Amino acid sequence: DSLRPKLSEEQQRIIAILLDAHHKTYDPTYSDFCQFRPPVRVNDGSVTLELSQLSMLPHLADLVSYSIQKVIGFAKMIPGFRDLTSEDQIVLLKSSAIEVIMLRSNESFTMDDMSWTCGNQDYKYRVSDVTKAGFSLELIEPLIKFQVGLKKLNLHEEEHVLLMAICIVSPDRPGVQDAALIEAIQDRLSNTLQTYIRCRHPPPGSHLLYAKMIQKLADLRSLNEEFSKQYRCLSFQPECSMKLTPLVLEVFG
Numbered sequence: 147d148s149l150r151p152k153l154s155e156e157q158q159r160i161i162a163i164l165l166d167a168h169h170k171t172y173d174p175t176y177s178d179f180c181q182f183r184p185p186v187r188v189n190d191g192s193v194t195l196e197l198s199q200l201s202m203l204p205h206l207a208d209l210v211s212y213s214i215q216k217v218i219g220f221a222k223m224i225p226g227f228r229d230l231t232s233e234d235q236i237v238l239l240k241s242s243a244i245e246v247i248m249l250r251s252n253e254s255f256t257m258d259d260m261s262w263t264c265g266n267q268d269y270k271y272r273v274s275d276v277t278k279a280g281f282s283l284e285l286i287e288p289l290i291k292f293q294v295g296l297k298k299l300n301l302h303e304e305e306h307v308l309l310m311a312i313c314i315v316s317p318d319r320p321g322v323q324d325a326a327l328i329e330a331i332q333d334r335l336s337n338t339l340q341t342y343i344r345c346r347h348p349p350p351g352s353h354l355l356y357a358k359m360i361q362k363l364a365d366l367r368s369l370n371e372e373f374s375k376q377y378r379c380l381s382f383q384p385e386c387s388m389k390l391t392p393l394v395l396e397v398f399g
């Protein structure tokens with residue numbers, strides 16, 4: 147009964163632009179990673195030790211900062227994003243940043259050992275590394291769970307880049323001015339996604355896929371809520387700002 151309309155020339159363009167944007171802003175070789183402050187790993191197995199040393203914070207804070215820059219570059223290439231006021235663009239970028247980082251990080255996440263494998267042994271990021279950066283299991287365990295859930299969706303890159311675009315351009319973000327314009331841009335991206343799934347995705351991965359993707363966006367809201375708490379707690383640690391970056395401090399502060 148459900149119709150399967152073809153992708154319009156505009157919808158085909160949007161996909162092309164977004165695939166192009168991601169390829170311009172996501173390096174699948176992770177070759178810039180050696181330019182960050184070195185990853186330091188010590189003995190642990192302790193929250194007191196974690197906050198005392200914060201050995202993995204300078205490296206992962208440089209990684210996140212770097213990733214924010216890429217997300218910013220990616221957002222500016224979303225069809226319609228430049229039409230928004232620069233004030234609204236920043237509100238959207240600032241509230242979605244960590245969520246899009248979690249989304250895009252899926253490309254490096256592997257279910258072989260439940261880590262983010264960005265090559266090497268140094269640039270393999272386990273759960274233990276994230277605690278060494280001063281974050282608790284309240285964030286990390288649901289994050290890993292989200293990563294696995296998203297991986298099992300076996301998303302086409304097209305679906306993957308549209309989901310990030312939809313995540314960024316969200317009318318229901320605190321502090322937004324022209325919510326009508328943001329919703330209009332999101333709807334254009336959402337229809338493209340819904341149309342893509344219905345006429346490009348083969349069974350049984352096609353059935354109810356869009357609803358599962360919308361649910362992942364809701365999971366991202368929860369992780370962002372928890373991340374915000376933990377970042378606030380982390381910022382209370384003396385001499386913490388040096389371990390972070392001016393960009394990380396503004397976006398999350």
Ligand SMILES: C=C1C[C@H](C[C@H](C)[C@H]2CC[C@H]3/C(=C/C=C4/C[C@@H](O)C[C@H](O)C4=C)CCC[C@]23C)OC1=O
Pocket residue numbers: 203206207208209210213247248250251252253254255262264271276279281394
């Ligand atoms: C210093 C930190 C760490 C924390 C980041 C959180 C806890 C998670 C979210 C995604 C995770 C990771 C993502 C991995 C990558 C590598 C690559 O896929 C690019 C992608 O943008 C990315 C960030 C691995 C370590 C912990 C990260 C950064 O926030 C911070 O500011």
